[PDB]
Amino acid sequence: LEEIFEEISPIEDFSGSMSLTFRDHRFEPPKNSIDECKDRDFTYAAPLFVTAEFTNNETGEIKSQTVFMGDFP
Amino acid sequence: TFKVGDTVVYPHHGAALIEAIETRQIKGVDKTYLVLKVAQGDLTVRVPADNAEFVGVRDVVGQDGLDRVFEVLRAPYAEEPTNWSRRYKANLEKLASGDVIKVAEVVRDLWRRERERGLSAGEKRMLAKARQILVSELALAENTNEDKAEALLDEVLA
Amino acid sequence: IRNVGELIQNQVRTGLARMERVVRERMTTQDVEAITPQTLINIRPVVASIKEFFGTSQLSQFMDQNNPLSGLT
Amino acid sequence: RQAITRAMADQARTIRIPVHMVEVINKLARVQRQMLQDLGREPTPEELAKELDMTPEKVIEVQKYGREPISLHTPLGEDGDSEFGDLIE
């Protein structure tokens, strides 16, 4: 997952102004146990976070934030 | 102009606190970056001091701010165009301007419009966002508690 | 052989490419100083791609539990 | 934009939906997506009902009306001849 997050390079617009970078990915323990998922018709998954920072060159402004990318099975 | 431990108002995010001064080098130039954060979105903002005035940062206004925003909040004879599209295009521009007087006028007129008939559910999102950023701006200006900040405005907007 | 890791990685890559197209379309019609990492990216393509992989696919197969030998096979 | 979204309301769906119901359902979809990306979880229909100022029964009726038909000719799997339309009486 770190390979596929680093594959998405910080992209640039037509003016080459913005950039966003997914530095680190991390996992939390699943909210439902395996027997809970089996019994109650759920999908055994854990939340997947990534630390995305938004950097603008013209303003010199960096916005580092953690965004929830989905329940990875 | 900017020190450590002080509170600074950043546009579209409200009041924020500065942690430390960063000396990251870009192309061999030691820019004087400063890092700040809010408690709303859990994000860190790094701004150099040279272009801080250009990006639109602004300090804490003292006793000269609450009285002027109250008197423009109590100012009568405010009118809007009959077509809702022109007012809709004007209000987000006034929000993006970042002026405290402008956002106070926008929230006062919008609240009056919601009181008289009731506008919609879509505009509730932006009224809520504007009230949140305005109460965050006034909360750290008077150094009052956030519940006290939202309570004190309840008896003055009528 | 594309193992389970490579297959799920390819599906996540397709989802992230769709997300990159969506965020490009978003930033082409958005003003600066109003962009937040929580806003311009959408995790819907990634979760949609993952869920479309784990169901209705020729690779993610309903496991047969006739006996332990069938499970291992 | 007005004509394109009007024709999308009146022509894209096989079971035609009026334009006011189309804007209601897509507004509900976009606010549900916003709550999903904010809270990080699927929002409960009751919270959606309060934030949309509508009754929960109206909310579940809107979610019911926001569907898409599935074709009768979708194959089940390895066999091409056994169709989805031949499994229903």
Side-chain angles (χ1 to χ4, degrees), chain A residues 7-58:
Chain A
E7 187 164 0
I8 298 297
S9 176
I11 63 175
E12 315 294 310
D13 52 353
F14 292 135
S15 67
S17 73
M18 61 79 71
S19 56
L20 79 166
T21 315
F22 301 111
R23 275 192 300 111
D24 175 38
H25 88 289
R26 63 182 296 271
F27 280 115
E28 286 191 355
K31 73 200 82 53
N32 270 332
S33 69
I34 185 73
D35 210 346
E36 192 79 19
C37 289
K38 199 173 302 298
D39 190 359
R40 311 213 51 255
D41 217 345
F42 286 125
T43 286
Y44 186 42
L48 162 70
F49 301 133
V50 73
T51 301
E53 68 268 17
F54 195 82
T55 296
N56 197 4
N57 52 9
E58 299 163 7

Side-chain angles (χ1 to χ4, degrees), chain A residues 5 8 10 18-26 48-55 61-69, chain B residues 41-46, chain C residues 16 19-20 23 35-43:
Chain A
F5 278 156
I8 298 297
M18 61 79 71
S19 56
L20 79 166
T21 315
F22 301 111
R23 275 192 300 111
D24 175 38
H25 88 289
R26 63 182 296 271
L48 162 70
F49 301 133
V50 73
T51 301
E53 68 268 17
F54 195 82
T55 296
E61 198 269 334
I62 294 92
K63 292 181 181 180
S64 300
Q65 209 188 15
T66 294
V67 55
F68 161 77
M69 291 295 298
Chain B
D42 291 331
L43 73 164
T44 65
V45 174
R46 294 101 179 276
Chain C
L16 280 176
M19 187 212 59
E20 212 68 1
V23 71
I35 297 169
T36 304
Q38 268 313 97
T39 61
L40 77 164
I41 68 174
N42 195 17
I43 72 181

Side-chain angles (χ1 to χ4, degrees), chain B residues 100-131:
Chain B
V100 194
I101 297 170
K102 293 193 182 296
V103 65
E105 194 260 346
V106 174
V107 301
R108 192 256 303 165
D109 193 328
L110 207 56
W111 173 260
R112 281 184 181 181
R113 280 182 75 217
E114 264 278 351
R115 265 195 170 175
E116 56 95 18
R117 153 197 41 91
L119 312 175
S120 168
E123 291 178 352
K124 181 190 69 179
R125 282 147 66 234
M126 60 224 77
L127 171 62
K129 176 183 176 180
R131 281 189 290 105

Side-chain angles (χ1 to χ4, degrees), chain B residues 120-122 124-125, chain D residues 30 34 50-52:
Chain B
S120 168
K124 181 190 69 179
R125 282 147 66 234
Chain D
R30 73 192 289 277
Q34 284 150 18
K50 273 78 73 177
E51 70 183 319
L52 207 68

Side-chain angles (χ1 to χ4, degrees), chain B residues 2-6 18-24 31-36 46-47 49:
Chain B
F2 299 105
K3 296 176 293 298
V4 67
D6 62 358
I18 290 174
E19 272 68 55
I21 296 90
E22 203 65 36
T23 62
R24 285 174 67 186
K31 274 98 164 183
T32 58
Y33 276 82
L34 58 91
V35 67
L36 61 83
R46 294 101 179 276
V47 177

Side-chain angles (χ1 to χ4, degrees), chain B residues 29-153:
Chain B
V29 180
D30 216 339
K31 274 98 164 183
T32 58
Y33 276 82
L34 58 91
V35 67
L36 61 83
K37 73 190 300 295
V38 308
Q40 181 189 5
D42 291 331
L43 73 164
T44 65
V45 174
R46 294 101 179 276
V47 177
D50 54 22
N51 55 355
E53 275 78 19
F54 291 97
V55 74
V57 311
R58 194 263 304 158
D59 291 331
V60 167
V61 183
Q63 275 76 25
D64 186 74
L66 73 164
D67 62 358
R68 66 175 62 251
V69 304
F70 280 160
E71 67 96 15
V72 306
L73 190 136
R74 265 80 168 266
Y77 301 97
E79 61 98 20
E80 290 297 325
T82 65
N83 215 329
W84 73 273
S85 178
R86 276 167 197 79
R87 175 207 304 118
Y88 180 74
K89 195 170 291 295
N91 55 47
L92 76 164
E93 270 152 7
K94 286 185 100 53
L95 290 171
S97 57
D99 189 358
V100 194
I101 297 170
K102 293 193 182 296
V103 65
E105 194 260 346
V106 174
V107 301
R108 192 256 303 165
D109 193 328
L110 207 56
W111 173 260
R112 281 184 181 181
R113 280 182 75 217
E114 264 278 351
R115 265 195 170 175
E116 56 95 18
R117 153 197 41 91
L119 312 175
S120 168
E123 291 178 352
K124 181 190 69 179
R125 282 147 66 234
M126 60 224 77
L127 171 62
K129 176 183 176 180
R131 281 189 290 105
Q132 204 272 317
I133 64 169
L134 190 142
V135 76
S136 67
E137 201 269 327
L138 67 95
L140 280 190
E142 197 176 0
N143 285 336
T144 185
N145 292 336
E146 81 305 337
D147 65 348
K148 299 304 170 300
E150 68 182 2
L152 61 83
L153 61 83

